[PDB]
Symmetry: C4
Subunit: 297 residues, 4 copies
């Protein structure tokens, strides 16, 4: 009578099966979407962590073809200033808005300052507001996502974090332009030890991807990626892109080597996986390849 | 032809799935029952171990809104004296009887001294007698539970330890006001190594909770809890409250830091779990949230 | 298309479920059978290993109520002499033949000396001949078992080692008075590493016990027992008794503390298990209690 | 909605079940095929690695009754010269062509030099060309296999590496005389860590063997074998022979003890497994014995 919904799988539970391939790793397309309205040339997002993303690293992420989410452990005036630095800043893949400015995102919470914070970020020219808490399937987050969409209809909004189909549907209904997936996997996050709560990330991604199929709402896989192999698996489970934190934290660009080298490795691995599965682009990678389930052995 | 009843799960086999939430962790209700007749403001009980509960720690447990079970590795006269110390002793959550005295429990076994021991404890004003052995699904325990209920009808009686539906039904039929669950999990208890006997505690709790549904008989989860996360899982599997031993053993109040700090952490974690699952009170937490099963990976 | 017969379980895969109990550990019966014709007061046999059983330890085993199998890494004349020492040697449980002599067994192989070896052992008064090789489901062993039964009908004969129902039936048909179970589990035996061959011992025991049900042919569980808990599980899976090697190897009685202390511990644990399962005797222990299957966690 | 094809098993997931046996290990036949046209007296192939197979070790492998595949991390002229050394070189089991010359194979890739490389190797008298890449289920490999078969019909050709039924069928259709199985298991190969790609080798072998049943196309198990036990399991899963790399790398014969000692051990273990399963020859070993699946425990 124990209420078990399903067996749920993490990265180490699965491997990608090779499939017939004609397109070499160097030739596949990595283009994807962050949100309904924002495209990325690589499926990489940097985390809204105070050890990872401020203006310097967000500029670098945008130049690489991804995007950075400025963390919110700072005052409103400073966070707006971080956004302005990016917006005012050869990188052929660079993520840019219609005015040719580098794209940037910024995190907000649900606390008392949120309305004022969102307004300041929008005024600073932020491309996307990320309503970002430990539990996105909540009145607080869902209300705030709807408020941002209704109040600032010209900005993109992301809600998270979630790990279920029901949560995905709730955020989509609130007007989210993308959802962020990950409850438990944050490299350690002591969510499992302290609250006993979590959903293994491969299942979490797949369940959200299935819920959002046909909606046009992207999903971002946030947490638990240690190697480029995990990144490839996240994509095949259905993620549109992956958010990384601690792997970027030691870099020259992160707050007190080069980020470019880590990005190159990560995308090298993803390209290798696409070659193995015969996936010519991200849409194929998300929808066609298969996994095998493996044992502890 | 190997006689396997089921696959049985322990704490590390499962995680709680987040659900829609509106009530913040700080605002949920932790009120529950220890027995048919005894309510607790927090779902915490201290173990009847000689390294854990004598009068000092039992007083502290009652003040925190839980209860202590005085251990029985002492003479009858001393155990009665321990009970009197608690009964004769701002704590707004304090567990108190109808006379405004702090509640306390006391353990007895099945040996020759039991009748005299029970009589002395009852005379000392004990709120609940815990008939407490390694194997509660036994003639000795079931007979003693019935005897206490028939002889001292105004005292509460707990029987344990058990790990099966059949055992739960047997104790309920004997007149138990609550049952205590745990064969194997006692942090090590060498029951598994020496006798090869045990039932993984999440399954044990769920099986007992199902057997007792609609009876009004609470069940206490005893053993194996290392982190607040385990406590949350125990509740969702169906426990009314949790008994802890070794985690309290190092405290200022335990027999030769403060117990309050550990209680605060444990309840903090439970509150976090209730927030994640959208459980506003313990009755909801016990009956509504779901688990995912996870692999070793 | 991989040819997998079943999932097979070892000791650590299972735990015994407690059942209603009235008979205390100190009061249960440990009496069992080694073979069709030989009874034992405890379900313990010492291994035919040159670090475990020569006359000294076999005498001690018989006195304890079990039996020793003299190893065969010695000349025929010495092995007969070892047997004579036991046969010619307060121990109320002692295993004795109809003449009041301590019982003893002796191992033989399938090599050229076997006929002469068996004849010498029988002449020396051996109670049971153990035809003992790494692979008992073989022409060599099955032929030798039939030969011993036809040539020396008044001696008991054991064949092994086996791990399948088919093998059990083959030895029973050859006239074996008991079969010995264990391919792989010998504490390390590098059978799994070198040949990739083995059957997890709990499944091996259960499969053999099912094959032999109603035949009157006992089965001996040989190998892999590290703790008294494993011994209890072996019995509930269907073993009539257990053979131990390395656990006895360090003892005062084994070839270059007391064996009695280890026997006392092992039987103490088995008694505890019988108490937990409510098994009053070995026949009940073999046939009534249930297991739960558990995870790595 | 996670796209999982199957649960897939590796060596440590399974054990061989003993079966009725009459043929001793020393008496079983180890004869098998490398390709449609090439027979081997033992089922052993050395890897095309620059730490494993050049002329010296390939000569030794052929003398032992197996074959070596000369690695391709060298110029065309040197690789042809390596082949000539073997072709121009008591060993009763020696692998020889119709002219009495030791057999040898050589690896090629898919790069620009392949046509010229293949021509030079064929002119040098190579017995088999191995079109050898990380992903054999690819346009590059399948095209090259067909080209070699159509251009040099008198040479044997192997394609690999693959891990699926579909891939096996594709190579067979291209004209491959054998396929090589292994994506992931190469002792570490960081294919799993970097690309997240792989198929546990026991399942990979069985799936390919099933696809090729009745075609006359052999399959070679390449990678992941640490012990002779793994070798036996690979055969029973359906491999015709096994390719080994790192285990040979430290030997006197490998590029900067004796290879013979390692071969003797490996075949000793395989012989032991055939004895346990009652397999008199390789065809029996491949098709008749069964596995049990085992747990982490
Ligand atoms: O201080 C924190 N608060 C909340 N979430 C965090 C914090 N640090 C890391 N995380 C989570 O963990 C993710 C990073 O995971 P990582 O790539 O494994 O380091 C973030 O994007 C967040 O979702
Ligand atoms: O000395 C003992 N005898 C019997 N049970 C014990 C003893 N010590 C601990 N336990 C059990 O283990 C539980 C404590 O588990 P813990 O919270 O993991 O330390 C107790 O409530 C008892 O059920
Ligand atoms: O040298 C040996 N040859 C064959 N079998 C052995 C040898 N040593 C131990 N065994 C096996 O392993 C069993 C002992 O297992 P143990 O109680 O785990 O030490 C023996 O009864 C034998 O079945
Ligand atoms: O440098 C390499 N490139 C490609 N494959 C390799 C390399 N080294 C080892 N392998 C693979 O790993 C196999 C050897 O596996 P091993 O017997 O476990 O050492 C080779 O036959 C190859 O399939
Ligand atoms: Mg900073
Ligand atoms: Mg700073
Ligand atoms: Mg004391
Ligand atoms: Mg004291
Ligand atoms: Mg000796
Ligand atoms: Mg000696
Ligand atoms: Mg070289
Ligand atoms: Mg060299």
């Amino acid at each position: 009578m124990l209420r078990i919904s399903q067996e749920a799988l993490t990265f180490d539970d699965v491997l990608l099966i090779p499939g017939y391939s004609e397109v070499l790793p160097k030739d596949v397309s990595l283009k994807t979407r962050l949100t309904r309205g924002i495209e990325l040339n690589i499926p990489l997002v940097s985390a809204a962590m105070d050890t990872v993303t401020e203006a310097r690293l967000a500029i670098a992420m945008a130049q690489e073809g991804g995007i950075g989410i400025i963390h919110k452990n700072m005052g409103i005036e400073q966070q707006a200033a971080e956004v302005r630095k990016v917006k005012k800043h050869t990188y052929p893949l660079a993520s840019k808005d219609e005015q040719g400015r580098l794209r940037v995102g910024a995190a907000v919470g649900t606390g008392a300052d949120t309305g004022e914070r969102v307004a300041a970020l929008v005024a600073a020219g932020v491309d996307v507001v990320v309503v970002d808490t430990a539990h996105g399937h909540s009145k607080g987050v869902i209300e705030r996502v709807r408020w941002v969409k209704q109040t600032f209809p010209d900005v993109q909004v992301i809600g998270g974090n979630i790990a279920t189909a029901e949560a995905a549907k709730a955020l989509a209904e609130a007007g989210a332009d993308a959802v962020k997936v990950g409850i438990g996997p944050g490299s350690i996050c002591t969510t499992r030890i302290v609250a006993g709560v979590g959903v293994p990330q491969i299942s979490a991604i797949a369940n959200v991807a299935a819920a959002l199929e046909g909606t046009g709402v992207p999903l971002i896989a946030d947490g638990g990626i240690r190697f480029s192999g995990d990144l490839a698996k996240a994509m095949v489970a259905g993620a549109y892109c992956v958010m990384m934190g601690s792997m970027f934290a030691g870099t020259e660009e992160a707050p007190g080597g080069a980020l470019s080298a880590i990005v190159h490795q990560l995308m090298g691995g993803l390209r290798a996986a696409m070659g193995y599965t015969g996936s010519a682009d991200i849409q194929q990678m998300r929808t066609q390849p298969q996994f095998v389930r493996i044992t502890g052995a």
